[model samples]
Target chain A: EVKQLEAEVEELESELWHLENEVARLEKENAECEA
Target chain B: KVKQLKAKVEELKSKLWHLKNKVARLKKKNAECKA
Candidate 1:
């Protein structure tokens, strides 16, 4: 694991949360359109 | 605080692993579909 700056880690966690939510939404979208 | 920072890093790492696996699965499907 790469050692992160303290602020960087918090930023990453926040970004990750938003990203995961987007991914979950996309998955639902894909399921409707694809197999 | 440094404590929340450390926890954030750990959770971010876990989130990354989940996203990576999801991407890997999608890649495999696209390859199978020849798209």
Candidate 2:
């Protein structure tokens, strides 16, 4: 149903944000390592 | 090591891209359902 679908979307959005943050952190670390 | 970090960053970015697509799909579905 729409409710369930929206809920899933919310969860995925949260996960997406977290993943982006993780990627940013790793990229920063990698850049620092190369410097 | 730097290589390992680079690999991890790539993997995470791939996952992030996939998740973003998934979220977009779900949001579209939700909008259609509400319409």
Candidate 3:
């Protein structure tokens, strides 16, 4: 089914968010270091 | 079908760099206090 395939695609698409996680991590570190 | 989806996933993964580009744009625009 196309709907099922697209659903799978949506799940895989979200795996792109690692960049967002790293940005949050770095932003927090910067704030903590008072820089 | 799974093989095709995997290829598309790689393309979508690399699309994460758009986030980096957005950050660059913001940093540049932020430095334009006199512009």
Candidate 4:
């Protein structure tokens, strides 16, 4: 059970990192467009 | 130990929800810009 939970947490962290980068990228593009 | 993992999952889920919302909002804005 602990191992499964650990794997889940790792997966979530990976996805979270990807989303964070995506948000930053989009925000940068939006800012440029607005400017 | 299991309890801690469960709590971590809950916390990650909350963060993921907020990030997903942000992504959706940004995508909408991008679409609007294109339109």
Question: Which pairs of residues have clashing backbones in candidate 2?
Answer: none
lDDT of each: 0.68, 0.59, 0.60, 0.92
Q: Of models 2 and 4, which has the larger DockQ?
A: 4
Ranking by TM-score: 4, 1, 2, 3
- The DockQ-based CAPRI class assigned to model 4 is medium
lDDT of 3 by residue, B10-34 (tens): 6775676676665555445444432
**Among these predicted structures, which one has the highest lDDT?**
4
DockQ of candidates 1 onward, in order? 0.22, 0.05, 0.14, 0.79
| lDDT per residue (tens digit) for residues B1-35 in model 2 | 55555555556557778866755555555555545
TM-scores of all candidate predictions against the true structure: 0.55, 0.52, 0.38, 0.93
lDDT of 1 by residue, A1-35 (tens): 33455667867777777767766765665565566
lDDT of 2: 0.59
What is the C-alpha local distance difference test score of candidate 4? 0.92
The TM-score of candidate 3 is 0.38
Superposed on the true interface residues, model 2 gives a C-alpha RMSD in angstroms of 19.0
How many collisions per candidate? 0, 0, 0, 0
List candidate 4 stretches off by more than 4 Å: none
Off by over 4 Å in 3: A1-8, A12-35, B31-35
TM-score top scorer: 4
Runs of candidate 2 exceeding 4 Å displacement = B1-35
